[PDB]
Amino acid sequence: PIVVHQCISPRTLNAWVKVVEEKAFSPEVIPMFSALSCGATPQDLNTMLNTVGGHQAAMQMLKETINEEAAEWDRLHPVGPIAPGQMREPRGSDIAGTTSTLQEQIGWMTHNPPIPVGEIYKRWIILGLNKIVRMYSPTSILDIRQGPKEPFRDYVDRFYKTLRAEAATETLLVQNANPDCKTILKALGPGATLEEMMTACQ
Amino acid sequence: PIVQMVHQCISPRTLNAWVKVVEEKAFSPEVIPMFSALSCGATPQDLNTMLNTVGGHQAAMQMLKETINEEAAEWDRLHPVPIAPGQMREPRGSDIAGTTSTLQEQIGWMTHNPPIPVGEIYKRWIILGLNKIVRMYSPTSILDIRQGPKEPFRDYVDRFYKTLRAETLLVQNANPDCKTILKALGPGATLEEMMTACQ
Amino acid sequence: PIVMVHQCISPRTLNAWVKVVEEKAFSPEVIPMFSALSCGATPQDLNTMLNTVGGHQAAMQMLKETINEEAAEWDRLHPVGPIAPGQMREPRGSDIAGTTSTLQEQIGWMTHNPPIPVGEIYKRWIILGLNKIVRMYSPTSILDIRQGPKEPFRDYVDRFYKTLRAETLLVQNANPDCKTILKALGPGATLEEMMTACQ
Amino acid sequence: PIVMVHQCISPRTLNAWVKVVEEKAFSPEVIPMFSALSCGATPQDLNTMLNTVGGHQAAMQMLKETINEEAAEWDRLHPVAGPIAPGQMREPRGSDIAGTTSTLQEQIGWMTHNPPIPVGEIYKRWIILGLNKIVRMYSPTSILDIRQGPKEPFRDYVDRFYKTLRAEAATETLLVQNANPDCKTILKALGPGATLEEMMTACQ
Amino acid sequence: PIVMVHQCISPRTLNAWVKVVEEKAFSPEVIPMFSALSCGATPQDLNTMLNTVGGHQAAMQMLKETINEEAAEWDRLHPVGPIAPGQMREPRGSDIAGTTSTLQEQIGWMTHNPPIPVGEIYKRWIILGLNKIVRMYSPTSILDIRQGPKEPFRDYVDRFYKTLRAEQTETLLVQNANPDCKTILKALGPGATLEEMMTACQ
Amino acid sequence: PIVQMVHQCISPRTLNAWVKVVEEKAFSPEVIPMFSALSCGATPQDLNTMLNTVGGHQAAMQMLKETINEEAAEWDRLHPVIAPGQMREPRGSDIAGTTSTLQEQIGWMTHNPPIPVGEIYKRWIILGLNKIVRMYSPTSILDIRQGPKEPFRDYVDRFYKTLRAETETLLVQNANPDCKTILKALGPGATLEEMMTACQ
Ligand SMILES: Nc1ccc(S(=O)(=O)N2CCN(CC(=O)N[C@@H](Cc3cc(F)cc(F)c3)c3nc4ccccc4c(=O)n3-c3ccc(S(=O)(=O)N4CCOCC4)cc3)C(=O)C2)cc1
Ligand SMILES: Nc1ccc(S(=O)(=O)N2CCN(CC(=O)N[C@@H](Cc3cc(F)cc(F)c3)c3nc4ccccc4c(=O)n3-c3ccc(S(=O)(=O)N4CCOCC4)cc3)C(=O)C2)cc1
Ligand SMILES: Nc1ccc(S(=O)(=O)N2CCN(CC(=O)N[C@@H](Cc3cc(F)cc(F)c3)c3nc4ccccc4c(=O)n3-c3ccc(S(=O)(=O)N4CCOCC4)cc3)C(=O)C2)cc1
Ligand SMILES: Nc1ccc(S(=O)(=O)N2CCN(CC(=O)N[C@@H](Cc3cc(F)cc(F)c3)c3nc4ccccc4c(=O)n3-c3ccc(S(=O)(=O)N4CCOCC4)cc3)C(=O)C2)cc1
Ligand SMILES: Nc1ccc(S(=O)(=O)N2CCN(CC(=O)N[C@@H](Cc3cc(F)cc(F)c3)c3nc4ccccc4c(=O)n3-c3ccc(S(=O)(=O)N4CCOCC4)cc3)C(=O)C2)cc1
Ligand SMILES: Nc1ccc(S(=O)(=O)N2CCN(CC(=O)N[C@@H](Cc3cc(F)cc(F)c3)c3nc4ccccc4c(=O)n3-c3ccc(S(=O)(=O)N4CCOCC4)cc3)C(=O)C2)cc1
């Protein structure tokens, strides 16, 4: 990271590997990635991505997304030989740390004002991670129906777990409740809160 | 958190501690003070980071947004809001929750002399919501905590006050043997005294 | 704790206190661990630590009663118009316990020259309460620690002093064989000597 | 590593490297972990880390051969001759970069010189060359043998495909070819230029 | 410990000492671990560490007796009206043990130029007591460490010297070897090293 | 270790790491470089601290003293041996921290130029640790023969594991018939990578 270039710590390295081992591409992996990559350089981001073993389908999908974003960046911000000793503008492949050196990355990130290549690359990675999370999501919200014996709260957990991978209350949530709870919910007037709905089916 | 005045990253130890607490204790009451301690110094972004890392409990987490919203809207009522160039704008409710504010703005408010402590304000909101969740996930009313016929007084009292924390009766709801003894201590007895007398 | 400014309680500290209470309940050595883990602590930090304890809510309520007696007694010995502007007010008992005081006030008192050490005072109260709890949860009277007919002397002595810590007799309560030997050492024998003689 | 003076390798670092090797052997992701754990490393630190590995001594000896080829090639490109100028900084031979004939002070000297001779980063590059050769060796399967099972979900196939490939455009050639008949037909119907995301959706 | 001001004992330190005692009781190597974990310690820190030990209360009471003998002997060798105002008093034995001294007084002595190292003195006392405990909890006399008829020489030697360390080679080691190895060892005759003895019975 | 230039305490992480390594790996060869890394910056006292925390292996630990002594005595031979307030020269027993104080150790180590008593003592300890590692080594390289069903790579692991505790002369010789024939056909100058590919 940049704090000066600090090395990624062992605690950070291990935390990212473990999260991926234990949670695959469950949605909460994304904010953990983002938090664990606080201050990160493109190199640090590549380091973190490279340490993931397995999920190589997902990881290759992630490269495709990163590429689309690199190419689009080159469209919006185009770039002879550079002025000697001066700071060049970064191409998309520089933001991803493919054609840039660590010193160049630090240069951009600490420049006054900053070209925050870390934060830009992170944004791209997260775009790709979100696409993966939807893909690895096993179920459509349309198929989250409350079991005949399922407590309302557990249903709601599934409902919103599923929804996070891809107003909700007033449409599909009541619709997809089981008959007993659906009747009770319908009897509550418009504009009922989730707290209220859950109390009423407890 | 905040560490010329600049954002320190949330540490891995902090991140993991919060996830684990939620995994192991769900919405048992002591999760709240742990959240508060683990979020010492936190910016709104750090608070959002911590909340977002929770997997599961998405009913609870959506309930939490509703509460946060009520508090945001009420804040906009009490403290209403083009801004002077290069000066510090006043934060709306959605800025305190880190929805419409940047990290730099959050640091700005928090380190301003005097401080607008948007971290502490947002934390207060989150805790309001966390308390509502804790009551919800509380399985039992204090009215239903009755001492078992063979239950030692101390275990009863643990349950009594466990239940009460999630939300006279104590003697009332004791079992006949211990109720008689307690009544004989008469007014003003301490809990230590009650517990000794039924040991 | 304090560094003049508040350092956050660390995750390692938070977890250590929770684990100690989970694993050892109110065994006597929990007290010195609490005291060590709360080194430097503000009243807020002490409340944070106490609040993170799940379970034992009977004990925790007992602890409040004790804290209250000590708060009231403090108000007796050190009584307190509106304060001089911008000057440091004297702390009431409820301020020492962090109930009616702010963090800044706590830091104020603790770092003042000379210090009003509200952290150390509150800690002293908590430990008073923790000691009462430890005696309560102590299962056995020292009067009932008798050496088994087949029990090695050392194990007896461990139990003897374990029990005694939670709250002459030692020789008295030894088993016949070892009692005879001990009596033969006659007055002024050391514990090392007693234990060698019954090994 | 370096702080101008040598900081010790930390216990956390030492243990992390040993554990990675214990748990993952020479699976590909060991390499970037080695590289990250050896951030800031001196040649001595790199030797320390390599020496703490128990087992895999075939691999570790193979690694020396590779390091040697790179040392010798370095001596070809950057030669040295007489006795050195008193009190001055000598140029490093290949065996100096590997920390075999160099002192810690010399390593720090080169690494912190203005401008730096980054002997740590050079030696690391060599080690990684050798680690890659080992990873291919310990790779059990050729990409040519990664065929989708008749009941294997496309995604699992793709995981294996690219796991295998990492140890040694791929989509358009062998990936479709080696898919199972049902999914191969579907993929062929998408025709040129399909993305991996698209292929995977179509066989889900 | 000390940084002039008191640093708190760390949780890592606290836990390490408790665990050592839980896992190894009063095996000899607990002593040097205690000493290392108590580097820089004040008398208060030493009391803190001793107080966190649960169980072994016989041993812990024995330890007080030893500490007392050393306190009283210290008062004999270094005897002590009311003190000069604002000046540094001389420490009595009970001050070194942190019984009648404040933390500030302990820091005072320890950081004075020149130092009265009350931490190191108290540590020395504690270790004296810990050694007496280690001998006590030692189950076996070196006289009873005999090599089993099937026991490899090396294992015997481990036990021999384990036992010997708790009490604190040309004689008893050969003597107590089993017949087969005893004959071989005797044939090496005077002046054999342990390395040589062990090779010869491997 | 060392940071008035002053002694930093050995950390709990360091202390525990050394104890655990010895518990889990005994005197397998890789314990040595771990000892050396964990004892980075160490004073003689720190080295004694680390050695003293080892429970068990007291045969080995006594053997280690013998080796340390030989090296102490030899040091006294090569460098024989005071002015008020000045720095005395260290005897062998001073390097091992037996007759020296912590302050003296720090003195030597931070003197300009340094008398690196930590590094010297470490060198001695490692000499002794190496003798122990050979001793606890169960097998001679002469007895590492490839099993009839053993994959070449596993054989090579054993070969070099064994060899480290104490190449392609004995390595090919001791291979199993099938692989030995193939290896011999590669003829002089084959690399280990090549040998291993050819028997995979
Ligand atoms: N044609 C073909 C297809 C597959 C294979 S393969 O399956 O055998 N194999 C290739 C090698 N790696 C490692 C790798 O390239 N890792 C990235 C980081 C990364 C890891 C991920 F798991 C997922 C990500 F999205 C990004 C990397 N590591 C760096 C390390 C040290 C310095 C530099 C780099 C750097 O640059 N990158 C890297 C970063 C971004 C891209 S890009 O594809 O997204 N891109 C291209 C240039 O324009 C900008 C964006 C490519 C590589 C593999 O993952 C798997 C081989 C050939
Ligand atoms: N109707 C409907 C129903 C479900 C879904 S969903 O299930 O698909 N989905 C939405 C997206 N996220 C992430 C998210 O929004 N997280 C919050 C923090 C948070 C996490 C919690 F688990 C619980 C909380 F209460 C708060 C957030 N993450 C940030 C991250 C990076 C920068 C900024 C933010 C920021 O601002 N917030 C955020 C904070 C507060 C609110 S608010 O709803 O309470 N609010 C609205 C504006 O006024 C201020 C207060 C909203 C978002 C999800 O978790 C779930 C979508 C629509
Ligand atoms: N009559 C009755 C019976 C039960 C319940 S209840 O079961 O619903 N419930 C209420 C809430 N809490 C939390 C709580 O109050 N925690 C304390 C710290 C503490 C925790 C313990 F587990 C044990 C202790 F002894 C002390 C606290 N937390 C703070 C946090 C943030 C800022 C401030 C505070 C602060 O001030 N205190 C606090 C500290 C001391 C006291 S006191 O009662 O001892 N006291 C009163 C004023 O005079 C000084 C001393 C009260 C609260 C509960 O545990 C129990 C409610 C009413
Ligand atoms: N012919 C033959 C066959 C087997 C054996 S053996 O099996 O009995 N045995 C020998 C001793 N070591 C330790 C060792 O050499 N370790 C290396 C680091 C290292 C570890 C690895 F596991 C793998 C690597 F590739 C590199 C080392 N440790 C240092 C430590 C303290 C200071 C200095 C050193 C230093 O210099 N090196 C070292 C580093 C590189 C090489 S080299 O062979 O690659 N090379 C030689 C000169 O030109 C530069 C490069 C040699 C030694 C063993 O592990 C194995 C001995 C001879
Ligand atoms: N007659 C009789 C006999 C036993 C019992 S009892 O079984 O109920 N017993 C259990 C143990 N503790 C704790 C305790 O005293 N801990 C010591 C340190 C210590 C712990 C050990 F486990 C072992 C040690 F050897 C030393 C202590 N804790 C401090 C903490 C906060 C500030 C101060 C202190 C301080 O001063 N000391 C302390 C240290 C040394 C001694 S001394 O006895 O060795 N001594 C007396 C004065 O002259 C100097 C030396 C006494 C207390 C008790 O209170 C009482 C009750 C009545
Ligand atoms: N004849 C006979 C035979 C056995 C026994 S015994 O089995 O009962 N024995 C076991 C071990 N210890 C502790 C001990 O001596 N530990 C060493 C460090 C060490 C530990 C090891 F496991 C292995 C090593 F090689 C070195 C030590 N601890 C220090 C601590 C605090 C300050 C100082 C010291 C210091 O000096 N040394 C120490 C270091 C080196 C040597 S020496 O033997 O190698 N030597 C002698 C003088 O010339 C220089 C070198 C001796 C002691 C005992 O006292 C009791 C007693 C008498």
Residue F36 near residue F118 (C-beta atoms within 8 A): no
Q: What is the dihedral of CA F18, F19, F23, F26, to 10 degrees?
A: 50
D93: burial class by Cβ within 10 Å (0-12, 13-18, 19+)?
middle
Mutate-to-test residue for ligand 4 from D34, D44, D50, highest number of ligand atoms within 8 A of CB: D50
Of all ligands present, the nearest one to the C-alpha of F102 is: 6
Long-range contacts of A4-8 (CB under 8 A, 24+ apart): A5/A41, A5/A102, A5/A106, A6/A39, A7/D1, A7/D36, A7/D39, A7/D40, A8/A40, A8/A44, A8/A47, A8/A48, A8/D36, A8/D39
Decide: helix, strand or coil at residue E2. Answer: strand
Handedness of CA F37, F38, F43, F47 (dihedral sign): negative
Q: What's the CA-to-centroid distance between C64 and ligand 3, angstroms? A: 7
Burial of residue F89, with CB atoms counted within 10 A of its CB: 0-12 exposed, 13-18 middle, 19 or more buried: exposed
Q: Which ligand is nearest to the CA of A156?
A: 2
How close does chain B come to C195, measured CA to CA in Å? 35
Fold of A141-202: 1.10.1200
Tokens of A35: 């938090």
Which residue stretches of F114-199 are H helix?
Answer: 117-135, 152-165, 170-173, 177-186, 192-197
CA distances from A54 to A122, D21, D41, D167, E12 (A): 21, 16, 28, 12, 35
Which chain E residues contact residue C195 at CB under 8 A?
Answer: 58, 62, 136
Q: Would you put residue C41 in left (φ > 0), alpha (ψ -120 to 50) or beta?
A: beta
Task: State residue D6 phi and psi, 5-degree precision.
Answer: -65, 115
Report how far ligand 5's centroid is from the alpha carbon of E64 (Å): 7
Ligand 6: does its nearest atom lie under 6 Å from the Cβ of F61?
yes
- The SS3 of residue B198 is coil
- Using the mean position of ligand 6's atoms as its centre, give its distance from the Cα of residue F128 in Å: 14
- Cα–Cα distance for residue pair B126/B18, rounded to 1 Å: 14
C-alpha dist (Å) from residue F84 to F87, F88, F99, F108: 9, 10, 19, 16
Give the span between the Cα atoms of A167 and A171, in whole angstroms: 7
How far is it, in rounded angstroms, from Cα B27 to Cα B135? 9
Q: What DSSP line would sit under D131-171, residue for residue? A: HHHHHHHT----GGG----TT--HHHHHHHHHHHHHH--TI
**CATH architecture entry for E1-141:** Orthogonal Bundle (1.10)
Name chain C's partners: 3 or more CB pairs within 8 A: B, E
Phi, psi of D89 (to 5 degrees): -90, 115
Distance of alpha carbon D60 from alpha carbon F30, whole angstroms: 13
Cis peptide leading into residue F114 (ω within 30°): no
Q: What SS3 state is found at A31?
A: helix
Q: Is the dihedral of CA B129, B132, B137, B142 positive or negative?
A: positive
Tokens of F122: 């470490």
Taking a C-beta distance cutoff of 8 angstroms, is the pair E40, E2 a contact? yes
Find the ligand nearest to D56 CA.
4
CATH number belonging to domain E142-202: 1.10.1200.30
Tokens of E103: 């933390």
For domain D143-204, the question of CATH label 1.10.1200.30 is answered with: yes
Alpha helices in F26-57 (DSSP H): 31-38, 44-52
Beta bridge partners of A5: A2
Please classify residue F116 by burial: count the beta carbons closer than 10 Å to its beta carbon, then call 0-12 exposed, 13-18 middle and 19+ buried: middle
Query: Alpha-carbon distance D109 to D92, whole Å?
Result: 11
Q: Check: CB of residue A82 under 8 Å from CB of residue A88.
A: yes
Rg of chain F, C-alpha, whole Å: 22
Residue E20, CA distances (Å) to C33, D189, D200, E13, F12 in order: 16, 67, 54, 11, 11
Whether C165 lines ligand 5, by a CB cut-off of 6 Å, is: yes
The 3-state DSSP class for residue A105 equals helix
Domain with CATH 1.10.375.10 in chain D: 1-142
Question: Which residues have C-beta within 8 Å of that of residue E102, sequence separation ≥ 6?
Answer: none
Residue A2 token pair? 């940049």
Chain breaks in chain A (C to N over 2.5 A) after: 3, 79, 166
**What sign does the CA torsion over A51, A52, A53, A59 have?**
negative
What is the C-alpha to C-alpha distance for residues D193 and E11, in angstroms, rounded to an integer? 59
Residue with the smallest CA separation from ligand 3 atom 52 is: C99
Give the CA angle between residues A97, A102, A105 to the nearest 5°.
70
Ligand 3 nearest-atom number relative to CA C71: 49
Q: How far is E117 from chain F (nearest CA, A)?
A: 14
**For ligand 4, mutation pick of D34, D67, D129 (most atoms within 8 Å of CB):** D67
- E16 three-state secondary structure: helix
The experimental method is X-ray
Residues of chain D with CATH 1.10.1200.30: 143-204
Determine, for residues E27 and F63 on separate chains, whether the beta-carbon distance falls below 8 Å. Answer: no
**Where does CATH 1.10.1200.30 sit in chain B?**
142-199
Cβ-based burial of F158 (10 A; exposed 0-12, middle 13-18, buried ≥19): buried
CA distance D117 to D119: 6
Q: Chains with ≥3 Cβ pairs under 8 A against B?
A: A, C
- CB neighbours of F75 closer than 8 A, spacing ≥ 6? F91, F92, F95, F120
Residue nearest to atom 35 of ligand 4 (CA): D100
Q: Spell out the CATH class of B142-199.
A: mainly alpha
Interface of A with D (CB under 8 A): 7-11, 13-14, 17, 47, 50-57, 59-61, 64, 131, 135
Q: Is it true that the peptide bond before D115 is cis, omega within 30 degrees of 0?
A: yes
CA F57 – ligand 6 centroid, Å: 14
Inter-residue contact A138 to A56 (CB < 8 Å): no
CA–CA gap between residue C61 and residue B156 (Å, rounded) = 13
Residue C133 near ligand 3, beta carbon < 6 Å: no
Q: What share of chain F is helix, strand, coil (3-state, %, to 5)?
A: 60, 0, 40
* Topology (CATH level 3) of domain D1-142: Human Immunodeficiency Virus Type 1 Capsid Protein (1.10.375)
Inter-chain contact C65–B192, Cβ cutoff 8 Å? yes
Which residues in chain A are contacts of B19 at CB distance < 8 A? Answer: 32
D contact chains, 3+ CB pairs < 8 A: A, F
Hey, what CATH class is F1-140 in? mainly alpha
* CB distance F15 to ligand 6 below 6 Å: no
Phi, psi of A102 (to 5 degrees): -55, -45
Q: In chain A, which residues have their Cβ closer than 8 Å to the Cβ of B58?
A: 156-157, 159-161, 163-164
SS (H, E, C) B10-24: CCHHHHHHHHHHHHH
DSSP designation for A138: -
Query: Tokens 């390395």 label which residue?
Result: E195
Residues of chain F with CATH 1.10.1200.30: 141-200
- With an 8 Å Cβ cutoff, the interface of chain C facing chain E consists of 1, 10, 12-13, 16, 24, 27-29, 31-33, 35-37, 39-40, 154, 157-158, 160-162, 164-165, 190-192, 195-196, 199
Phi and psi, residue B67, nearest 5°: -65, -45
Pick the CATH number of F141-200 from 3.40.50.2030, 1.20.120.450, 1.10.8.60, 1.10.1200.30: 1.10.1200.30
Q: Could you give the residue range(s) of every CATH 1.10.375.10 domain in chain E? A: 1-141
D92 in contact with ligand 4, CB cutoff 6 A = no
**E99: CA distance to ligand 5 center in Å?**
8
Q: Which of C46, C52, C56, C99 to mutate to test the pocket of ligand 3 (most atoms within 8 A of CB)?
A: C99
Torsion over CA: C8, C12, C13, C17 (sign): positive
- How far, in Å, CA of F127 to CA of F64, rounded? 9
What's the CA gap between B134 and B136, in Å, rounded? 5
The residues with which B2 forms a beta bridge, in sequence order, are: B7
Q: How would DSSP label each residue in F87-104?
A: PPPPPHHHHTTSS--HHH
- How far, in Å, is the centroid of ligand 2 from the Cα of B68? 10
Amino acid (1-letter code) at residue F131: K
Is residue E101 within 8 Å of E43, Cβ to Cβ? Answer: yes
How far is it, in rounded angstroms, from Cα B76 to Cα C122?
39
Q: Identify residues after which chain F is interrupted (C–N over 2.5 A).
A: 3, 81, 166
Determine the residue among A32, A164, A201 to mutate to test chain B binding: the one whose Cβ has the most chain B Cβ atoms within 10 Å. A32
D6 three-class SS: strand
